[PDB]
Design a protein around this ligand. Structure first.
Ligand code: ADP
Ligand code: ADP
Ligand code: NI
Ligand code: NI
Lengths: 188, 183
């Protein structure tokens, strides 16, 4: 398939460019976005392509790596993606940083990778990276569960992503419960 | 007196932070009560053991004598100063009843939900992967964390370790659902 080859092209590029926004996160989010897209009857090629390049423009990437919108667009077109599809992908990644149907799917997959056991891991790695405490202040990893991560299930766009988020969100709840036991007074 | 030690020791992005020390002193003190240890010794040794650790950097790392002489200055007896110094030197060298308790407290804080957290904080602080290397957080579970339960000295610690260990397995199972092909 033209599309399979183009997906593969995009994957190698994205991996090359990038090598909590590492290739492994992007690859997980692409796989998850395609699964949700399939269930949701969204356009699979747009979902996967947007999922793969969504972080390339993100203000969080260091400046040796981060791309301009025109750089992503030109690379897509060079790789054989029609201008119309390329426009749609561009619409999604710029909105992400009403989102389109496929944009909502990608956003959902992205938020799913921020919850469950994976999201817990990513949260504590971030805290470790930025020199924040495990708990004890408003910049802490534990605070971030309450400010953000535990609310993500309410922000899911699709039924499919809402269904997947349930088990992950409940698992974060079990994780918080275990921290409350391992560490009496953690909340105060 | 234990209050004057808690102020000084408070005065680290490596896994040897204050919250960990404070956690482990409270745990040590709890375990020590069950295992009939000298609670003042346990709390003090728990509070100061990391100060001389070779894993702690040069800019912070204190010498044994500095720890001894600071303790004596806060007004500790020679008896208890020697016992504490005994404990913290036995724990802290390269290729490492009151010591057992302090060691158990320390190990326990490396497992369960809390240990998961510190492992990932560690991997983040040193720039290591979530998974994929032998140097990754996920690898450390199998290399170290999942076998800590079988290195516990006291009955009390062994019992506490069970639920923490079982939870780490639940965590790892969820992670394998979240990340297909993580192995
Ligand atoms: N204040 C915080 N404390 C702990 N983890 C965080 C914090 N902010 C973001 N994270 C986590 O770090 C990862 C990277 O997030 P970030 O780069 O800030 O936004 P995004 O990944 O959505 O572009 C995500 O899993 C996110 O949940
Ligand atoms: N390779 C690793 N990956 C993830 N976490 C680690 C690794 N090595 C140590 N840690 C974590 O950092 C903390 C401190 O461990 P370490 O300094 O090795 O032993 P100790 O402090 O008990 O002498 C612990 O929570 C431990 O699990
Ligand atoms: Ni992302
Ligand atoms: Ni320690």
């Amino acid at each position: 398939m033209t599309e399979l080859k183009q997906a593969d092209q995009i994957r190698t590029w994205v991996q090359s460019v990038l090598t909590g926004h590492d290739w492994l996160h992007i690859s997980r989010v692409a796989d998850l976005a395609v699964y949700i897209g399939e269930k949701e009857n969204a356009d699979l090629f747009i979902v996967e392509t947007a999922a793969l390049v969504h972080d390339l423009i993100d203000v969080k990437l260091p400046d040796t790596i981060r791309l301009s919108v025109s750089e992503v667009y030109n690379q897509l077109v060079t790789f054989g993606i029609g201008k119309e599809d390329a426009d749609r992908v561009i619409h999604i990644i710029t909105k992400m940083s009403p989102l389109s149907i496929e944009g909502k799917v990608v956003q959902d997959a992205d938020r799913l990778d921020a919850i469950g056991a994976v999201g817990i891991a990513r949260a504590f790695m971030f805290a470790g990276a930025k020199g924040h405490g495990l708990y004890g202040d408003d910049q802490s990893a534990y605070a971030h569960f309450f400010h953000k991560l535990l609310r993500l299930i309410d922000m899911m766009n699709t039924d499919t992503a809402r269904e997947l988020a349930e088990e992950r969100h409940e698992f974060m709840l079990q994780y918080i419960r275990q921290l409350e036991k391992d560490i009496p007074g953690i909340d105060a």
